[PDB]
Amino acid sequence: GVLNQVLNDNIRNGHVVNQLMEALMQLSRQQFPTMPVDYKRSIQRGILLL
Amino acid sequence: GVLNQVLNDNIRNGHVVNQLMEALMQLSRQQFPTMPVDYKRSIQRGILLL
């Protein structure tokens, strides 16, 4: 009888995080040409920690 | 009725900063063959600040 706001049924059986990891691993695999090495190093470590 | 020293009308609508940032990003992406890495690093950090 009651309306309900339900999640996707893909968030529930957690596989969204695999797409997230795919994206983050890709961004690790790139280079940051515009920016120095220390900045990229900081960011890529920050996402390896995830 | 009065003379006036008007600006360009491409400056009033801030677009010249795009020319500037494009030039700065080019200069950052280039290497400094003749010079060390600490100088390049300092310059490129100073360019990212802006």
- Of A31, A41, A33, the closest CA to residue B44 belongs to A33
- Copy the structure tokens of residue A24: 């983050």
Q: Using what technique was this structure determined?
A: cryo-EM
Contact between chains at B44 and A35 (C-beta distance less than 8 A): yes
A42 touches chain B (CB under 8 A): no
What's the one-letter identity of residue A10?
N
Resolution in A: 4.2
Tell me which residue has tokens 């596989």: A15
Question: Residue A37's closest chain B neighbor by CA?
Answer: B41
Residues 6+ apart with CB under 8 A from A43: A32
Question: Residue B21's closest chain A neighbor by CA?
Answer: A34
Contact between chains at A35 and B48 (C-beta distance less than 8 A): yes
- Of B18, B43, B29, the closest CA to residue A31 belongs to B29
- Copy the structure tokens of residue B17: 């900063």
Question: Residue B40's closest chain A neighbor by CA?
Answer: A36
Alpha-carbon distance of A33 to A29, in angstroms, equals: 13
- Copy the structure tokens of residue B27: 């200069």
Alpha-carbon distance of A1 to A26, in angstroms, equals: 45
